[PDB]
A paper describes a structure:
To initiate filament growth, three junction proteins, namely, FlgK (hook-associated protein 1), [name] (hook-associated protein 3), and the cap protein FliD (hook-associated protein 2), are sequentially placed at the distal end of the hook. The [name] and FlgK junction proteins that are located between the FlgE hook and the flagellin filament are indispensable for the formation of the flagellum because both [name]-deficient bacteria and FlgK-deficient bacteria lack functional flagella and are immotile. To investigate the role of [name] in hook-filament assembly, we have determined the crystal structures of [name] from gram-positive Bacillus cereus (bcFlgL) and gram-negative [name] (xcFlgL). The bcFlgL and xcFlgL structures revealed that the D1 domain of [name] forms a four-segment structure, irrespective of the bacterial species.
Crystal structures for the truncated bcFlgL and xcFlgL proteins (residues 45–251 and residues 48–364, respectively), which lack ~45 N-terminal residues and ~35 C-terminal residues, were solved by multiwavelength anomalous diffraction (MAD) phasing and single-wavelength anomalous diffraction (SAD) phasing, respectively. The bcFlgL structure was refined to 2.2 Å resolution. xcFlgL was crystallized in two different crystal forms, and we obtained two xcFlgL structures (xcFlgLC2 structure in space group C2 at 1.9 Å resolution; xcFlgLH3 structure in space group H3 at 2.2 Å resolution; xcFlgL structure refers to xcFlgLC2 unless specified). The truncated bcFlgL and xcFlgL proteins adopt one-domain (D1) and two-domain (D1-D2) structures, respectively. xcFlgL contains an additional domain, D2, compared to bcFlgL. The D2 domain of xcFlgL forms a β-sandwich structure, which consists of a β5-β12-β7-β8-β9 sheet and a β6-β11-β10 sheet. Notably, the D1-D2 interdomain orientation and interface are essentially identical in the two crystal structures of xcFlgL (xcFlgLC2 and xcFlgLH3) despite different crystal contacts, suggesting that the D1-D2 orientation would not change in different environments and would be recapitulated both in solution and in the flagellum. Our comparative analysis of the two xcFlgL structures (xcFlgLC2 and xcFlgLH3) indicates that the N-terminal and C-terminal regions of the [name] D1 domain adopt diverse conformations, as observed for flagellin. In the xcFlgLC2 structure, the α4b helix runs downwards as one α-helix. However, in the xcFlgLH3 structure, the α4b helix is split into two discontinuous α-helices (α4b and α4c) due to a sharp directional change in the helix. Moreover, the N-terminal regions of the α1 helices are tilted in different directions in the two xcFlgL structures.
Numbering used by the authors: 56 to 348, 353 to 363
């Protein structure tokens, strides 16, 4: 009846080991797909491309989003889902009204591979594909959707220039061609200043940089980064590339949208890379287990 326990520990160890190896490969391939998304997006800014060419790129991006879903729905060949957390009974990523939703859970199983010896199972898919910070990872900013001018959001960050950031959201709004106001989340007046094309705008511990010609009333929001799933980000690029771009206004809006999506993809690339690297020591410990060494624990290590 000790055979029963050894078998159970053995099978547990083999299962987690297989899953962890499949996770590592899946994160590598997600890396590659993200790198391909990044290249397609850079190319889509190219001013020589036609609307039709932009559409073909959008079509490739759609295919990449679809293959990222299949990857997110990888199985471990006992037929259990890799990225569902502990609810590894049904497909964790589902298409629903154009969004990809996560049906798995938030728990990374602690697999007991020997008495009081635990190995961390695969990450919940929420931690890989869904909970990806936006912007630069702590602040996010966008050109407002209703903007009528040609103001391009070039970059942004926390910045010690204007002092210290309180985590709050702000709005940079043009009141003349060469004048703007910054307002806080209650619409109170924080600062005003003179607009210079490509010069930093510093208020309340954050900075953004704008080029082109914002129209009167055009605004730019900035605030703490939230999270956005990888599928939505690819999706937004696809919808941006399908946009009409006949006027300077429409071109700026698409560029602003592409460029924001690209910042988010960079965050998505980093997550995959950072996630993969966070798992390597657990795989190395298992692989090198014999090099690193009579109880249940030692009898198990002597077989594997």
């Amino acid at each position: 009846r000790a055979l029963a326990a050894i078998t159970r520990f053995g099978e547990n160890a083999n299962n987690v080991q297989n899953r962890l190896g499949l996770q590592e490969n899946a994160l590598a391939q997600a890396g590659d797909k993200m790198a391909r998304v990044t290249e397609l997006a850079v190319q889509s800014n190219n001013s020589s491309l036609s609307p039709d060419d932009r559409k073909a790129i959008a079509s490739e991006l759609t295919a990449l989003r679809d293959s990222m879903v299949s990857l997110a729905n990888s199985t471990d060949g006992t037929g259990r889902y890799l990225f569902a957390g502990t609810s590894d009974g049904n497909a964790p990523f589902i298409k629903s009204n154009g969004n990809v939703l996560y049906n798995g859970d938030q728990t990374q199983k602690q697999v007991e591979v020997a008495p009081d010896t635990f190995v961390s199972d695969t990450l919940p898919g929420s931690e890989i594909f869904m909970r990806i910070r936006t912007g630069d990872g702590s602040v996010d900013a966008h050109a407002n959707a209703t903007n009528t001018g040609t103001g391009l959001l070039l970059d942004f960050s926390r910045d010690a220039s204007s002092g210290s950031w309180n985590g709050g959201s702000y709005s940079v709004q043009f009141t003349a061609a060469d004048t703007y106001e910054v307002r806080d989340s209650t619409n109170a007046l924080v600062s005003t200043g003179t607009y210079k094309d490509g010069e930093d705008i510093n208020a309340a511990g954050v900075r953004m940089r704008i080029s082109g010609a914002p129209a009167v009333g055009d605004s730019f929001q900035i605030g703490a980064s939230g999270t956005k799933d990888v599928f939505s980000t690819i999706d937004d690029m696809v919808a941006a590339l399908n946009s009409d771009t006949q006027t300077p206004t429409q071109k700026a809006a698409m560029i602003n949208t592409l460029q924001s999506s690209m910042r988010d993809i960079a965050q998505a690339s980093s997550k995959m890379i950072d996630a993969r690297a966070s798992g390597g020591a657990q795989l190395s410990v298992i692989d090198n287990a014999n090099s690193l060494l009579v109880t249940l624990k030692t009898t198990l290590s002597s077989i594997r």
